[PDB]
Amino acid sequence: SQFYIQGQVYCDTCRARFITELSEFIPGAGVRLQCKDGENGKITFTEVGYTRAEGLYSMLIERDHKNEFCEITLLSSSRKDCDEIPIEGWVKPSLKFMLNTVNGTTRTINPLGFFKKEALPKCPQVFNKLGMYPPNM
Amino acid sequence: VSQFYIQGQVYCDTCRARFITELSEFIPGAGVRLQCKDGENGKITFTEVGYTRAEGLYSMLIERDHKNEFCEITLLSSSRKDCDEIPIEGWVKPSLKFMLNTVNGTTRTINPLGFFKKEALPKCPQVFNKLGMYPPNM
Numbered sequence: 001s002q003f004y005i006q007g008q009v010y011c012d013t014c015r016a017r018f019i020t021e022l023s024e025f026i027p028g029a030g031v032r033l034q035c036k037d038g039e040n041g042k043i044t045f046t047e048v049g050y051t052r053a054e055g056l057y058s059m060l061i062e063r064d065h066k067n068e069f070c071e072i073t074l075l076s077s078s079r080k081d082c083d084e085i086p087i088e089g090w091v092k093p094s095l096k097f098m099l100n101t102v103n104g105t106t107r108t109i110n111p112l113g114f115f116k117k118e119a120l121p122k123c124p125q126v127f128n129k130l131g132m133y134p135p136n137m
Numbered sequence: 138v139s140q141f142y143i144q145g146q147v148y149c150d151t152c153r154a155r156f157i158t159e160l161s162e163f164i165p166g167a168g169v170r171l172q173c174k175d176g177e178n179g180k181i182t183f184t185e186v187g188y189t190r191a192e193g194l195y196s197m198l199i200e201r202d203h204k205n206e207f208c209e210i211t212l213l214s215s216s217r218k219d220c221d222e223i224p225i226e227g228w229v230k231p232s233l234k235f236m237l238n239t240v241n242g243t244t245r246t247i248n249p250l251g252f253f254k255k256e257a258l259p260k261c262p263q264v265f266n267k268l269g270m271y272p273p274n275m
């Protein structure tokens with residue numbers, strides 16, 4: 001009946017703002033789940049979740065907040081070399097989704113990463129394996 | 138006059154992962170729309186369109202001088218109908234938001250944009266496990 005949402009928090013090891021073979025996971029990371037409504041454009045509820053092993057965070061949504069606009073936001077990191085939240089120009093990197101499932105099956109959300117201060121030196125090797133021009137904005 | 142170029146890449150998200158993987162494939166001839174703004178809610182300073190050459194790489198021209206302008210790059214067209222779906226994040230179309238402060242005669246590289254291939258490919262589950270991550274379904 002309820003909604004099970006799963007997600008992971010990685011340390012963006014290479015400052016790629018996505019997840020590579022060099023990325024590492026963060027347990028004890030801060031994550032905010034927030035939802036809005038259509039009839040008001042307003043809030044509906046807010047819950048804070050924390051990541052366990054493999055950076056997995058989990059949250060159970062009762063169906064009183066059924067099918068509403070929801071976005072996730074990074075809050076805290078267990079790790080000071082990876083304490084920076086990468087902004088995309090002028091916005092915090094949200095992770096928008098809408099609250100729906102069938103057969104009650106868990107919905108796994110895309111991951112979110114914290115930026116490291118010093119990019120690893122083996123990163124040019126990684127972007128080269130994915131054959132992309134390394135981002136430097 | 139100044140001349141400042143910002144280039145990105147367009148890839149076919151073969152695994153429908155909303156990020157680029159070892160089995161992603163770039164799209165040459167894809168379409169990209171750039172648009173800058175006075176501010177977060179100001180008026181647009183301009184809007185240009187570029188297309189991707191080899192390796193899905195597109196080069197955008199900034200003929201002017203611009204500082205602290207609110208720009209974002211959006212997907213426009215694909216040259217491959219096997220990979221033409223633009224992914225949705227629940228209710229917004231994705232974009233590359235950045236603030237423009239040009240410097241003459243140089244190039245800045247931004248993050249890639251992906252088109253969704255309708256059928257994932259048969260060992261995409263194995264790439265997610267290479268990365269130690271649970272396969273997303275959003």
Ligand code: NI
Nearest residue numbers: 045062064065
């Ligand atoms: Ni409630």
